[PDB]
Design an enzyme around this catalytic site. Sequence first.
Site: not given
Ligand SMILES: CC(=O)N[C@H]1CN2CC[C@H](O)[C@@H]2[C@@H](O)[C@@H]1O
Lengths: 633, 639
Positions: A240, A279
Site C-alpha cells: 500500500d 501482494y
Molecule cells: C497486505 C495487506 O492486505 N495490506 C493492507 C490492506 N488490506 C486490504 C484489506 C484490508 O484493508 C487490509 C489492511 O488491513 C492491510 O494493512
Amino acid sequence: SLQPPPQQLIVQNKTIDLPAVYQLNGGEEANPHAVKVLKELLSGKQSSKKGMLISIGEKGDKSVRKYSRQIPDHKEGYYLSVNEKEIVLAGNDERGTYYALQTFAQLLKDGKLPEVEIKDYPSVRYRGVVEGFYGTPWSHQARLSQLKFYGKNKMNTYIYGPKDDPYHSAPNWRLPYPDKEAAQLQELVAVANENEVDFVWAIHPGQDIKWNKEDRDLLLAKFEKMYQLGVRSFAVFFDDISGEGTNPQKQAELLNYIDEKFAQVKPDINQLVMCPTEYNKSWSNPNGNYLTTLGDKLNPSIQIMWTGDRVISDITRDGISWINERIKRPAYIWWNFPVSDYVRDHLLLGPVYGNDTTIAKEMSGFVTNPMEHAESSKIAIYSVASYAWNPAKYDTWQTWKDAIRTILPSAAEELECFAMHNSDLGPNGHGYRREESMDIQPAAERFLKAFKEGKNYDKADFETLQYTFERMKESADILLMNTENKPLIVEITPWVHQFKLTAEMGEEVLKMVERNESYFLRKYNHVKALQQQMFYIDQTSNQNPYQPGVKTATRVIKPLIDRTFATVVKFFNQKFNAHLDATTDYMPHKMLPLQVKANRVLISEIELDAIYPGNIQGLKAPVKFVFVLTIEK
Amino acid sequence: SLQPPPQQLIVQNKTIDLPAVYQLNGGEEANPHAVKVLKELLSGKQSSKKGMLISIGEKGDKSVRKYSRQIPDHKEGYYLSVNEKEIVLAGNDERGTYYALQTFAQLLKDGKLPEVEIKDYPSVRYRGVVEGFYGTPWSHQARLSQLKFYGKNKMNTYIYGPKDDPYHSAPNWRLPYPDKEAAQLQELVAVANENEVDFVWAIHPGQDIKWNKEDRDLLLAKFEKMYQLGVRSFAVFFDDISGEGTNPQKQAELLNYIDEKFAQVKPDINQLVMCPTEYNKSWSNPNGNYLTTLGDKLNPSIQIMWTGDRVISDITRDGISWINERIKRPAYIWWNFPVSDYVRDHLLLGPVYGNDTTIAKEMSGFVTNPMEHAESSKIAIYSVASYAWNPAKYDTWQTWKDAIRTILPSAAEELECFAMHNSDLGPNGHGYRREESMDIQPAAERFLKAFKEGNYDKADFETLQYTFERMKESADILLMNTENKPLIVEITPWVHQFKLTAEMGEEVLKMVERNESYFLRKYNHVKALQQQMFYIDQTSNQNPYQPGVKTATRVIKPLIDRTFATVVKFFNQKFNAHLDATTDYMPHKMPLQVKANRVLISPVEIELDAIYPGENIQILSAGLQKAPVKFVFVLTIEK
Ligand SMILES: CC(=O)N[C@H]1CN2CC[C@H](O)[C@@H]2[C@@H](O)[C@@H]1O
Ligand SMILES: CC(=O)N[C@H]1CN2CC[C@H](O)[C@@H]2[C@@H](O)[C@@H]1O
Ligand SMILES: [Ca+2]
Ligand SMILES: [Ca+2]
C-alpha cells in the site's frame, strides 16, 4: 472434542480419574513452559516418588525414551497417551511438548480423563495472526489476551504491524519507541515466549524510504533496538505504497542485507518475513518484473507474504500454484479476514471458510489479519488456528461453534445468534462477501415473494420470522449484561443495541401484516420511531472517517423488514386512500435517498432540519436550503 | 374547548371567517401586549378604513365604552363577543384585555371563529407558580418558556425562590446577583411583563439573619437592587430554617418595616408576600402563638402563605377556615404538588386533584410548587391555572388531558400513557400519595389473586399484554419526539426505564404461558432486563437524596415482580429446580441496597462483587482509611 483436531486420535470407551497421588518424571528436563501448564493442572494433587506415572519430555529426554518411535517426526509434533497405568506427554521438540499439554488440558474435564492415544503435528509451519490493519491498534491488555489465546490454540506466530502505529510506519519508523511503549512491547515479548508464540516485529518503511546508507542503518538500528527489547523475528512490509520504495531489486537487496548482516549474524533469530508491494494477483503485473525479480533475488530463507487472487480472497489450489511458481518458494499467507477496516460499520463474526483444505504443502505460513475489535476477532482466529494446524479435518461450522463456546461459555447460544446475523460485509469495492442468516433465508424469500405478488404466505414462515426476532431480543439483552467477557461486550455493544432495534422493528412490521385501521397506525408509528432510533445509533456510535456507524443483520433480515414495511404501507394506502410514507430509513433532512455521514449531507432541492453554517462537491454562511454538502456540527 | 373555562359562555351555531379585511378600532389605546397578540393573529389579513369591525380596549376607552354594561366588574375580567358584524375584545382593565385575547386565540381554528359571547374573570386573585423547590433551579431558557405559558393560561404570578440559588438563600442573600445573572433576571422580568405575569422576587434570609440594623439594611439594599432590575413584587420566606430567624414578632416587624419604608415608598409595588415558619397545621405548634402573632401584627396588606393541613396536602374548607381565623386574612396557598424534591426518583405527571372547588373566596392566592423538571411540570401547572381561574367548573381529568394535548399535540396519546403510570410518589416521610394506573388495577388484582389463591381470565391476561405493548409504543415515540425537546430530555431516563418495565412485563407473561426450555429462555431474558433496570437506577439522576429512576411503581411493577416470583416458585416445584426468584438485581451478596457509593442492609457477611477501597461503616462507626475490602448498617467504598 479437540481444537485444533489432532492428526491421529484413537479413543476408548474408558475414562480415568486424574491422579490424587502421582509420580512425575522428566519435570526438570522438559520445556519449562509445558511443565508450568502441567503443574497448574495437578495443583491440589500430591507428587511422590511412587504413584501413577506421568512422563513429560522432548524426544531425546531420558523420561520419554520408551516412546521415541511414537513421537511424530515433525517440528512441533507430539505424542500423548492416557491409560489406566500412565500418562505420556512427549514432544518432538520443546514446542511440541507445550502443545501436547494444550491438548491434555482440553481432554481434562471435572478431574477426569479419557483413555486416549494421540499422534499430532501441524500441517502448516507458521500459524497465527498479523495485527496489520488500519484503525485503532489493539490495546496492550487486548494484546496480552491474544497471546495467551494463541498458546492455547497452537498458533506460533504474532506479527505486530498496526498500520497506524507511527513507530511502525512512516515517518517515525526511524525512531525508537518511547520508554512506555518500549516496556509494553518488552512485556508482550516475554508473554509471547511463555506461550510459545514468535513475536514478530514488522516495520513499514517504503512510503518515504530512500535507497541510501542513511535509511538502511536507521532501519537496522531500529531492528537492533527491537532486538534489545527481546524481539527475535522480524518483517519488512512494502504493502500500500507508491514511489521508489516499490522497487523490487532494492527491496530484495535490503532484505538480503538484513538477512546477511543481522538475521544470519545474531545468535538466535527465527523468522524473517517480507510483504510484497504486489501482494495479490489483481495488483500484480503479469508483464512486469516485480514478482519474478523477488522470487529470484530474495535469499531462500526469507518468507514472502500473499493475500491471494484478490485484495481480499480465500486461498485456492490454482491460486497458490500461480504465486509459488513466481516467488520460487511456498507463499506465506496473509489472509484478509476478518479484517473490517474497509467496512468499519460491520462486525464480521461469521465462520471461517473458503480456503482450500488440501494445499498445506503449498504454503509456508497462514496468518489472519483481524478486526480492530480484538476479542470479537477471536471467533475467526480460533477457527484459523484449527484450519492451519489440521486443514484436512477442518470443520467450518463445528469450529465456529467451538470458538463461540470457548470465548463465552456463559452465553454461547446468545452469541451464536448475534454472530450468525453479523457476518456479511455488505457491498464493498473489493467484492468480497460472506453468507449470513442462512437458516432463515428460505422462509424470508418465500414470505416476501408471496406478499409482493399477492399470494398467501405460509403461517410457518411467519412464525419462523417471529421466533427469530424474539430470539434476537433475548440474545441482545443477555449479551448487553454479560460480565464473563467485558472487553467483548464493550466492543460489540453498539451493534448489539442496533441488533435489538432491528428485531423490535421486525416484530412490529409483522404486526402491521396482521387487524383494524387504528392498530395498524399504532404499529406504523412505532416503526417510524424505531427507524429514528436506528438512525440515532448510526450517527453517534463508531463515527470514523471511512465507514461511520453501525450496520447489522444487513444481508437478509433488514432488507426483509424494510421491504415488508414498504409493501404493507402501500397496500394500506390503496385500501384506505391514505398517503402514509413508505420510506424505510429515517432521514431528518428532506429532498433518490439522502444520507448523513458525519457532518456531510449527501444524495445517494435539499432542505435541512435546521439552519447550519455551511462546502459543496467553498461556503461558514448560514444555510437551510440548497453531490455532497458539508456543514458544521 | 377553553382552558381555563370562562365564567360564562354563550355559543351560537354559526361560524364566521376571521375577516380578510378588517378595520381596527382601539389599537392605539388598548393594552399593547394584547394588541400584539391580536395583530399576530391578523397577519395575512389586511387593515383599512373598511371591512369588519374589531374593537379592542379597556372599559373607559373610546373604543369599547359602549359595552360597559357587558364588561364584568372584576379585576382582570373581560367581555368577548364574536358575531357576523363585529368582534369585541374588552377588558375591565389592561390585564383583562390581554386575557380576552388569550381566549380569542383558543377560539380561532382553521381561520374560523364560532359566534360567541363570553363574560369572564378569575375566581382567585393571584394564580401561578412558585419556583420554590430544592435541587437544580430551572434554567434560564426554561423560565422564559414558563412565563409565556403562564400568559397563555392566565396565571398572573411567578414567584422566584429556588432553595439552591445562593443569592436567594443563605449565605449570599445579602449580595447582589453577579452581572450575568442580573442581566438574565432583567430579561425575565421584561418577559414577565409582556405576558401579564407579576415577577415576585423572594428572599430566604432566615437561617442566618440577625435582628439588627445591619441585616435589615442589607435586606432592603438587596430589594433595591432587584427593583433596579425591574422587579415590582417581593417576598420574604421563613420556611425550613431554625434558630432566631423563626421569631414571629421579629418577622412581622421586618415585613412591616419593608412595607412602610419600601413598598409604600416606591410608586408601583404590587404584591408583598411572606411564607411563614409554621406553614402547615401539623407543623403548627398547638396553643403556641406563632400564627396568631403573625395574623395580629402583619400589616393587613401583606400576604401569608400556607401549604394546607400538612406539609403536602390538598386544600379543604375546614382546613382553609382553620388557617384564616388565625392569620386574620385569606391564606395565600403554596400547594406542594407536583414538587418531587423529596421523591426525586419519581416523576409526578398525574392530574391535579383534591382541592375543594368551592372556596375561592377563602384564598388570596393559589400557587403550585413544581418539579425541578420544568416542562414536565406543565401538566400540573396548566391544570392549576384552570382550577384557580374557574374552580366551580374545574374538571380534573379533562384538564389533565387538555394539558397533555397542548404540551405535546404530536404525541398526546403516548404522553398520556406515560403520565398515567407515572403519577404516584411511592412511600414517603410525608405520607402523601396519588392514584396511578387505576384503569388496569381491576384486571391486575384479579390476575394476581387467581394465582395466590390457586385460573385466570383470558381477558385480564390480554388487558395486561395490551398495556405493556402500549407502554412500549409510547416510550419509543416519546424518545424520538422533536416537538418539545426539552420535555423529552427531562423524561428520557424514565422513558428508558418505563420501556424496560413494559418489556419485562411481556417476558413474565410468556413465562406464565409452554415447555421447559422456553420457560428458561424467558426467565434468562427477565434476569437481563432486571440488570438493565438496576444499571439505569445507578447511573441516571444520581442525586444525594433519592437517586435513581422509579416508574410505574404503584400497580405495574409490583404486579410484574409478584408474577415473576410466583411462576418461578411453580417452576421450581414442578421441575425440582432452584431458580432464583428475587426481582431486583443486586451484584453484591449475603435485602441489599446500593445508593451512590454505599452498600447497606435494608434496616453476618457481605461479599462485594469486587475489591474496592473501603472508606467507613455506619451501623457506631469507623474510618476504613481506603483499606481494600471485598468481604465484610451501611458500608461506604470509593466507587
Ligand atoms: C497486505 C495487506 O492486505 N495490506 C493492507 C490492506 N488490506 C486490504 C484489506 C484490508 O484493508 C487490509 C489492511 O488491513 C492491510 O494493512
Ligand atoms: C413552604 C414549603 O413547602 N417549603 C419547602 C418544604 N416543602 C415540603 C415539601 C417540599 O419539599 C417543599 C419544598 O420544596 C419547599 O421549599
Ligand atoms: Ca528436554
Ligand atoms: Ca387603554
